[PDB]
């Protein structure tokens, strides 16, 4: 007759199905052509992980073969026909890990950070999502993973790349400058701040330093903090001015290249991960996305499809 | 039926009682006394003690033993088996006799491992013995074809509808069946367990039909129960996989109990499935990984 499994694979789109059904072609072809997922290779734990709980085992006589069970979503309703895997991963479970990822940055386990984060980012493709506005939030939460991700990337080179040239300053005062447009929340955001205020200040661009201190006070970071920035704010009152100029704007719209760390700003032409939303400029296009690093730069995508809702008739 | 006792407790899987009871009755016919042996055997070949069967049995020993003891160096020695099939295949072809139905349940269990189902089930056919009907109805399962599971099920169901043979037959068909169904399994494994007593194996089908509904944690009581008593125990650690997971455990712990599985049976064909999505899945990556 027919296996249970296979009834999985042709009742649903989702990937994390036929996962459970131990179909992988069929599901990396379904997360290569939905997401841009060329590179599997980070993907095998949790495909083997999610294959393993597919099905229980049971034994009908003893000295015999065990028998399989395969539970199913629908339980229920579903016939022998229209069975479909049971859940098993949630929406509510990556958001909790969120908050792990949360506390690793603000300690400054940035690289541990990012692991969890591109974690979660992966896992989000696998998930079953009941209702609309979840798959809003599974976006949201793909988003949330990226910008840390590029952003906090980006810090760890930053404070790799040397000190000595006035270039090299200008260009690390750049890269700080460029973190602060990245959408965290409000207690990294503040953290960022603080860091690039000091920068700027240092290089004697005053100027642009106010504005950092100004948009850090905003915050309403710990008073400690706030009386700092205050202090720091009214020394460059006095001499407000910009030493030397940046490739920085702080008003122009910008687009943080994953790879180079570069802006690109709003129309400039720039390539984008079909999966994370990350940026590049147009020469990674056809390579493998940093940020992601399963996807592909360059791919066109179907887009993710996370819930059944998503196909139509 | 004097064996009763000896057979039921073979049947729920507690192997133990049966041996200690198969020594206890005593034997009142040639007959009995074969069957006796047979189960007694069988019981040891359920614990995976094949030296006791294959030392034991001799070629003395009745027919219905000799098939016993085929099954066992079956099971214990991988290389003789392609040599006992083909010897099977002839004594099958080459020899009518029906009659020991010992004799068919276990080639058709050689069959059944050698992943012939159409064999196995045809010698199946020819037996007439309630565990036929019930080896046949599980076979049928495996092969997903439920509509002529259901048909033997009755068939025995016609026979014995109390015999436990019937009711674990029902709760197999039950748990393929899926919906309402799986209640009815669920209780028939309880009610046995409640019986006789908790066996590994009726704690396991019990999980089997909580998890098949949503009910995870539900489960986890029984699996609980079942790995107290036997780690190592393969559907055990396989149920718990799962179960963690839906859970919400740790991923290590769903790891330690893949582990703790390899250790008690590296052979075990959940391993090696395992094993083998691992292999293609490195396959696959190389097919859609970009070339260097």
């Given at each position: 007759g027919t296996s249970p499994t296979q009834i999985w694979c042709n009742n649903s789109q989702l990937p994390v199905d036929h996962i459970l059904a131990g179909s992988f072609e069929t599901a990396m072809r379904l997360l290569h052509d939905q997401?841009?997922?060329?590179?599997?290779g980070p993907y095998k734990q949790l495909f083997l992980q999610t294959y393993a709980r597919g099905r229980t085992t049971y034994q009908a006589l003893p000295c015999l073969p065990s028998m399989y069970s395969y539970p199913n979503r629908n339980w229920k309703d579903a016939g022998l026909k229209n069975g479909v895997p049971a859940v098993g991963l949630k929406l509510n479970d990556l958001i909790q890990r969120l908050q792990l990822c949360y506390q690793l940055t603000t300690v400054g386990k940035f690289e541990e950070a990012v692991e969890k984060f591109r974690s979660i980012l992966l896992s989000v493709p696998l998930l079953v999502v009941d209702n609309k506005q979840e798959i809003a939030e599974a976006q949201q939460l793909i988003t949330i993973c990226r910008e840390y991700i590029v952003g906090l990337c980006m810090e760890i080179e930053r404070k790799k790349?040397?000190?000595?040239?006035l270039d090299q300053q200008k260009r690390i005062c750049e890269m700080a400058a460029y973190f602060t447009h990245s959408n965290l929340q409000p207690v990294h955001m503040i953290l960022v701040l603080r860091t690039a205020l000091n920068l700027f200040f240092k290089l004697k661009n005053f100027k642009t330093a106010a504005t950092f201190a100004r948009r850090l006070l905003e915050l309403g970071p710990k008073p400690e903090v706030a009386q700092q920035t205050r202090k720091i704010l009214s020394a460059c009152e006095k001499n407000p001015t910009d030493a030397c100029q940046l490739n920085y704007d702080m008003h122009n719209p910008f687009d943080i290249c994953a790879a180079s760390y570069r802006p690109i700003y709003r129309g400039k032409p720039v390539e984008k991960c079909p999966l994370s939303g990350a940026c590049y400029s147009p020469?990674?296009?056809?390579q493998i996305c940093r940020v992601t690093t399963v996807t592909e730069i360059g791919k066109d995508v179907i887009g993710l499809r996370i819930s059944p809702l998503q196909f139509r008739l | 039926d004097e064996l009763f006792d000896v057979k039921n407790a073979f049947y729920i899987g507690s192997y133990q009682q049966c041996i200690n009871e198969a020594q206890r009755v005593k034997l009142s016919s040639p007959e009995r006394e074969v069957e006796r042996d047979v189960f007694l055997y069988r019981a040891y070949l359920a614990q995976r003690k094949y030296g006791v069967v294959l030392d034991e049995i001799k070629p003395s020993s009745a027919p219905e033993l000799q098939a016993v003891r085929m099954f066992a160096e079956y099971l214990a020695s991988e290389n003789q088996r392609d040599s006992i099939v083909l010897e099977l295949d002839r004594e099958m072809s080459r020899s009518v006799d029906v009659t020991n139905t010992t004799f068919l349940l276990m080639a058709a269990s050689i069959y059944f491992h050698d992943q012939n189902p159409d064999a196995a089930l045809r010698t199946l056919h020819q037996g007439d013995g309630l565990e036929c009907m019930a080896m046949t109805i599980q076979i049928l399962l495996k092969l997903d074809r439920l509509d002529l599971a259901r048909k033997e099920l009755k068939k025995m169901q016609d026979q014995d509808e109390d015999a436990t043979l019937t009711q674990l037959a029902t709760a197999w068909v039950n748990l393929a069946v899926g919906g309402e169904k799986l209640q009815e399994a669920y209780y028939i494994f309880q009610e046995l367990a409640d019986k006789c007593s908790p066996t590994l194996l009726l704690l396991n089908g019990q999980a089997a039909c909580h998890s098949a509904q949503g009910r995870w944690e539900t489960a986890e009581g029984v699996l609980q129960e079942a790995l107290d008593k036997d780690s190592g125990h393969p559907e055990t650690l396989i149920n718990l996989i799962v179960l963690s997971q839906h859970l919400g455990k740790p991923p290590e712990v769903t790891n330690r109990y893949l582990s703790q599985l390899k250790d008690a049976h590296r052979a075990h064909p959940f391993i090696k499935e395992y094993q083998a999505k691992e292999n293609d899945f490195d396959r696959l990556a190389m097919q859609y990984a970009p070339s260097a």
């Open positions: 997401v841009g997922v060329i590179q599997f790349l040397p000190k000595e040239t020469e990674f296009k056809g | -």
